[PDB]
Symmetry: C3
Subunit: 523 residues, 3 copies
């Protein structure tokens, strides 16, 4: 018997599977704390923007053309290139394949066929077929592909690896890579492809350079683009409006009151007119200008130009120094030699105490590093037990991860029906007496699908697959498992009742007021 | 064989049992961080007091009248209401029960009997019996009962649930609830009850309205009181003396230097003359006044009246703005137009730099939120392994909790003899070779009791019951277990000796100075 | 089959073994938070140095003289005292032992023999033998010994315990201890010992008082030194240059912006001319003077003398108050009655706002205590799973520890060959089907040794010994284990390939930018 799940928005019912072992991540002791010695108090003030080196892989759309022969053996084969041109120009595919000849079931027509959407396809690998039989079929998949720097090869979402640079345009093999078979690669200038293969009549679109590669079981096509125009090696991390900077003999140390991180760099600057900054220069400059306009246009003035620094940790810093206007000007905006001396003394007092404040703020900012390093070690230790929760806490977004020894694998989640989730009432393992499930078993259905699947209920509405988590049936038992807006009581590994979530208090770490439980009476 | 435990004050030897699954608690991602954008520096200063919504259940005393028939079947039955009046007025009970008639062993007297204390009873369920035989007996238990808002039903410590509002006084069923059998409920104006049932002659006391309900096996009585007079939905959390507040277009943001939490509310205020604030208004007002008198009466002045705000997180804030007296007044307390201008310039400089300081403090206070959120996730992950330790760390008090899947159950601890704790010498499981106990087995005795109980030694002098924790006998073994002021060495799962606690160093996280261990010599 | 490890500097391949259960450590709730109530703003400023009570054991070199009889029974015996004098004066040992008489194999010479280094010996227990046969042999070990306060006994690295004070010089048994057999103890004034026993001719050195004790199987010798001259009960923890101090009615509270810890003491001072401060007085004084010279010689002046305080937590504080020079002097260094009044008003304004800043800084410093206490509880909970990692994070140095119930044992690591580390390809337990290793098995060799040892690969290049960690073979499997600069893929518990470390991203907690994994397609 069953009981029925309840929807939720940010954490939908989903099955998260590991990306074939490819998206690996690991913890490293990369937090280094260096306490600044001098108590020097003439610190500079300014606006700062921080960019991080882009490690994420460039993602681009590819097309995968195949024909399917069934006798359930399901042989996949490459369509001929003329048939590929038919598919790209007319969105139609011919009803035969020849190697000696085969046709759709009980047919000989070699007629043209109109491609139609496969409704079983997803937001990745959107698929089109000529015969909707979800014999011979013709199939076109449009899907993602990822390539990490250096872009000398790319891996498509279907797991095929191609040893060709996604930016090799047939005239730059000296600045790119090509490692696949030469006789099976074809670049086409001004190639015309239809907008949607599933439409009987679609708006044709011309693409500058389209590349094709004849795989063994497939033909893979992708649109060649300009590297410097589509890929940027720096990703904007964060802008700090109130930044202070202390100068050493060969170091600039940047601190921010709102940030728990301090940056350290050499006093030599980066050439701002360098090509590696081309995709972030204007953005960073305008970000600095915006922060000035909205915050310091009236009370401050720009001191120097924009200076680019490279942090010891690898970050890139764009710096705009700011200096507050004199107190005479500030007062005039808010509204004789002896009066000039009075204002000079006021300015000296103000500057001295402001430098004291800035030194104190810099020390406060430096005070966070040891705590951050120790919490990093805490995260590394806890990631062996629940890597998904730890990485979600670190990155402040729902992240699924799996433990792989000394590394973690990132996983991608497929949203399921959300209304087919049926939780089983009996958590006792009937197939093995003495063993009980750790979390309740769920019946669920994938989208646009009807085959009932059996998984196990996880946390945050996640559905688990594979080997079910089991344990010893330690009677008496009383467990409460939450899914959606609902809680399920299991007494002695059998479903008892529903529980209102309002009947369960939430831990408040900020306030931390506790309620006394019911007393016991030596019973 | 045995070895003897040693006392300790804050963590007495105790057995902690879960409150029947009723006192549930869970972790939720309830820490939300919203970084304030503007660097506006005209922040307000003031005193703040913060109250939290009262989630704890209202607790009130009830009386449970029963008679006990033994033939060990121990049938419990409801005493007749006239016998209830005898018990309440004379503290005496009649020696018979009729349904056809029964008496104390080998008796027919139907004599009156004087109630005497049951010394086996505790600080909860204090109990009185007529025959001290720890046959027919007469018994009166006085015990706690809890009711959560809305007070439409209450659960007594003995686990009986009653569907009657603890504040239904027989004339307000429109503003209360009554769901029990009507024929079995009786309210009595000006009911006279004795102070102590165990005293031969006690001081009688009149109670305005006393309610009785005839259960199947019991009669339950409670004193009806005024809701608004006995229940308060707001609990005082904390007062901040140095509070700063930044004003947005539709937000007030409160920060405190001593607090790691910042509050955010709309600029619309709460009506301070609202009935829901009646039980906290005067207290909060006097708290604000006290903080002013002891801290700001001389150097500051009150700016505005007391403003009540409702925080986005549900807290209630009482705010008193304060403004420091002019520097001329401060100097005069510490002790012409051109001199007025000089003092105006001094005041302008002071105000500008003070606003800078306040903005920096607000940013520092906001810097804690991400760290607090990540530590909340750390606590949630660690609470699956040791919920009691994690909740004790969060609430800064000894808390016992049990893991119940996606929730935690709060547990209540019964203090045991404290001198009957005998630790067994052999941690090897004799009943199953190859298995060994994880922690040493303890013989202990409950208070006022003699039946020896067998449990397992826990941490912080806790005694564990139920299924003993076991593991594989991984020889060689060397474990040291601490109870009281003493440490027990177990070598190869057999007790070796005592260990002086002074011979074991304590980890110092603040100082963190380490001592090198004895070197090894490739042996 | 095997695959070959790769070197690393800070974490060399090593085997870490627990120091016989002697170097115990435990977590205790020793962080106490006391929030200061008054908002009083006339805080003192000064330089502070903090020393901690020395808990580490005094370590001193000892010599262990033995003769070895083999018939593999390997009886160890004490050399006669005249032979001990021969060893100490000539670095030579006689070729016989008598109790009736024995000689080197097939010999009768009773000739003198020259001691030569045993190359199998380490940086601890450096060893010298007369016959290099790694029968009768003569052996001299030079090794460490530890004694904790009170120094009434010491334990040598070979584990022998001696009930004699390392500072008993034969004339101070009233201020020391002697508990070993009186007839077997001999102190020798101006004893001459050679610098190196392994050298044919070495530079003789005279030692004031050398003590010998005739053990059953050994003779143990050590050089008696002056306690007060070799042992210091206070260890320097840390110096704070910018320290603020708030005065209560019976308390001084010290805070530092760069520190997350605040200190609290009574206002009564420690006598700086006390003998217990003799080994830290000059150092602390000069440290204070250095901080003044390099930071405050120009802008500040010393206020009062050096005051020594004892913190409630047991720390020792040396305090130098500093007061900034008047603004007139500061301005003159940077470069009538009415002008004196103007400068007095400027100074009053500056002092008022500076006191406000100092009060805010003190509150900020106090804000860390609850977070530190909660993180201490987090560390205590996590140390049961991985004590070495937690203690390494706390002390910021590579520390190996073992779990021992309610305590942790510190362990010492022996560096191995570093080039003999061979990782096995098959992680499946051949001796028991259905069980698999948790981490890959390693073949390794100890230094100067050839017997191949079988251990298990740990983290940070650690080699594990004893019972191998095992688990269920949960196929399919894909694990990646890192050693040196290399990563090993194991698919289905069989070695697959090497993995470039650059292909694995590192978690960045400070920046926290995430890359999306490859999407899934309902497969
Ligand atoms: C079904 O009908 C279609 C046409 O209605 C046939 O397609 C034709 O197939 C031949 C090869 O069998 C193509 O010749 C190829 O031409 C390209 C240049 O365009 C050349 O590079 C190749 O080496 C080869 O010679 C021919 O172009 C193509 N007709 C088109 C594209 O209009 C198909 O063969 C028929 N199949 C069966 C099984 O009857
Ligand atoms: C033992 O002796 C006592 C008196 O010494 C007997 O108590 C009496 O019990 C009867 C019922 O059996 C009570 O009558 C009840 O009166 C109330 C009104 O007061 C009425 O609502 C009930 O319906 C019922 O008529 C009587 O009041 C009570 N006497 C008192 C309270 O003084 C008891 O029955 C004797 N038991 C035996 C087994 O002999
Ligand atoms: C091997 O030859 C050496 C000398 O070449 C012999 O050493 C001698 O041994 C005797 C004891 O057997 C030592 O006498 C002892 O003298 C000390 C005072 O020095 C005294 O306290 C003892 O009670 C004992 O009388 C003698 O000094 C020593 N000769 C030296 C040091 O030059 C050794 O006995 C020979 N062994 C064999 C097995 O032949
Ligand atoms: C193919 O790609 C190369 C770069 O790999 C292109 O060469 C660049 O062309 C632009 C535009 O003329 C120049 O500004 C760059 O300096 C060139 N860089 C290099 C390294 O050659 C080339 O133009 C592309 N070819 C086609 C046909 O699109
Ligand atoms: C920073 O890099 C730019 C180019 O990115 C350099 O500009 C060159 O300057 C020299 C000298 O004036 C000219 O002859 C070149 O034509 C410039 N190149 C370009 C592409 O404009 C600039 O000099 C560099 N700055 C430093 C300090 O090395
Ligand atoms: C029973 O309880 C009701 C409330 O539920 C009492 O009614 C309140 O009585 C006080 C005093 O007269 C008034 O100030 C309140 O306004 C009343 N409130 C309501 C909602 O009625 C009632 O007085 C109680 N009855 C007895 C007999 O004590
Ligand atoms: C806040 O609530 C109080 C009552 O709690 C309101 O007081 C009422 O004010 C009106 C207008 O003066 C009077 O006619 C009523 O008699 C008052 N009621 C009581 C119980 O005194 C007050 O007006 C409310 N304030 C706002 C801004 O709505
Ligand atoms: C043996 O040790 C004692 C201390 O235990 C030494 O006595 C100290 O000697 C110095 C130098 O004369 C004096 O300043 C100390 O006051 C003495 N202290 C005590 C407690 O006696 C003694 O001198 C040592 N003896 C030898 C022979 O070295
Ligand atoms: C602090 O201790 C020193 C000794 O360590 C004390 O100095 C003694 O002072 C008295 C009075 O002047 C002299 O008679 C002694 O000779 C001194 N002893 C030494 C060893 O010099 C000092 O008085 C102590 N201070 C306080 C406040 O008790
Ligand atoms: C592709 O189209 C553009 C625009 O018409 C043209 O300049 C270019 O020459 C075309 N390609 C080739 C290979 O001629
Ligand atoms: C800020 O203002 C300047 C002119 O003062 C302008 O050049 C710049 O583009 C502005 N930046 C913005 C609007 O982001
Ligand atoms: C800043 O840039 C201007 C040109 O825009 C240049 O004249 C000036 O010298 C630069 N600043 C410095 C400090 O050299
Ligand atoms: C999802 O489940 C509902 C309820 O069973 C069903 O009506 C609907 O067709 C399903 N949607 C799919 C399978 O796409
Ligand atoms: C209860 O006692 C009070 C005080 O004597 C009295 O006013 C009230 O009327 C009594 N109850 C009834 C129901 O008469
Ligand atoms: C504070 O002083 C005022 C008078 O200035 C008084 O009304 C108020 O009750 C006092 N608050 C206290 C003592 O808590
Ligand atoms: C504060 O309360 C007084 C009455 O006590 C009232 O006159 C005054 O207007 C209130 N404050 C404001 C800002 O309206
Ligand atoms: C507690 O134990 C002590 C020692 O056995 C015993 O004398 C005492 O009576 C006990 N107290 C009880 C059972 O209340
Ligand atoms: C040890 O040598 C010193 C220095 O020559 C000497 O003063 C002392 O008296 C010697 N020892 C004995 C016991 O004579
Ligand atoms: C600091 O300077 C003073 C003289 O002003 C000197 O006595 C003291 O030793 C110096 N301290 C050092 C150099 O550490
Ligand atoms: C500081 O020490 C000097 C002697 O160096 C002494 O005269 C002075 O009184 C001491 N300070 C105080 C505050 O007593
Ligand atoms: C360490 O291993 C290397 C490689 O096997 C070997 O040549 C060398 O002798 C070893 N060193 C020792 C055993 O001290």
């Amino acid at each position: 018997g069953d009981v029925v799940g309840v929807n939720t928005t940010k954490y939908p019912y989903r099955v998260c599977s590991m990306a074939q072992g490819l998206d690996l991540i690991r913890f490293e002791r990369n937090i280094v704390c260096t306490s600044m010695k001098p108590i020097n108090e003439d610190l500079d003030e300014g606006i700062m923007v921080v960019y991080k080196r882009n490690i994420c892989a460039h993602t681009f759309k590819v097309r995968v053309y195949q024909k399917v022969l069934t006798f359930s053996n399901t042989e996949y084969v490459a369509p001929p290139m003329w048939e590929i041109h038919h598919i790209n120009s007319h969105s139609q595919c011919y009803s035969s394949y020849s190697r000696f000849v085969a046709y759709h079931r009980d047919s000989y027509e070699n007629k043209t066929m109109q491609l139609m959407p496969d409704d079983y396809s997803n937001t990745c690998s959107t698929r089109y077929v000529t015969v909707k039989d979800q014999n011979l079929n013709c199939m076109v998949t449009i899907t993602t592909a990822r390539s990490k720097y250096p872009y000398h090869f790319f891996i498509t979402s279907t797991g095929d690896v191609v040893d060709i640079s996604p930016f090799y345009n047939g005239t730059n093999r000296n600045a790119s890579y090509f490692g696949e078979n030469a006789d099976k690669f074809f670049i086409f200038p001004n190639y015309t492809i239809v907008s949607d293969f599933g439409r009987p009549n679609s708006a044709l679109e011309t693409h500058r350079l389209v590349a094709f590669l004849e795989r063994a079981d497939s033909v893979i096509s992708w649109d060649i683009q300009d590297e410097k125009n589509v890929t940027c090696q720096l990703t904007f991390w964060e802008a700090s409006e109130r930044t202070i900077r202390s100068e050493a003999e060969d170091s600039y140390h940047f601190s921010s009151a709102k940030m728990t991180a301090t940056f350290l760099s050499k006093k030599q600057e980066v050439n701002m007119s360098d090509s590696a900054l081309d995709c972030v220069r204007d953005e960073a400059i305008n970000k600095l200008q915006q922060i000035f306009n909205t915050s310091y246009n009236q009370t401050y003035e720009k001191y120097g130009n924009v200076s680019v620094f490279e942090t010891t940790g690898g970050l890139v810093v764009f710096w705009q120094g700011i200096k507050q206007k004199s107190l005479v000007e500030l007062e005039r905006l808010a509204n004789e030699s002896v009066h000039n001396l009075v204002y000079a003394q006021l300015q000296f007092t103000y500057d001295t105490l402001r430098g004291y404040i800035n030194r104190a703020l810099a020390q406060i900012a430096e005070a966070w590093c040891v705590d951050q390093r120790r919490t990093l070690e805490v995260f590394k230790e806890l990631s062996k037990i629940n890597p998904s929760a730890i990485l979600s806490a670190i990155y402040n977004k729902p992240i699924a991860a799996r433990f792989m020894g000394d590394v973690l694998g990132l996983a991608s989640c497929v949203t399921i029906n959300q209304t087919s989730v049926k939780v089983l009432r009996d958590m006792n393992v009937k197939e093995s007496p003495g063993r009980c499930y750790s979390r309740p078993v769920v019946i669920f259905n994938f989208a646009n699908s009807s085959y009932v699947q059996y998984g196990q209920l996880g946390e945050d509405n996640e559905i688990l697959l594979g080997n079910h988590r089991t344990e010893e049936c330690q009677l008496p038992s009383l467990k409460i498992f939450i899914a959606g807006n609902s809680a399920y009581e299991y007494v002695d590994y059998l479903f008892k009742r529903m529980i209102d979530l309002s009947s369960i208090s939430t831990v408040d770490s900020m306030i931390a007021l506790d309620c006394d439980p019911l007393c016991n009476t030596d019973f």
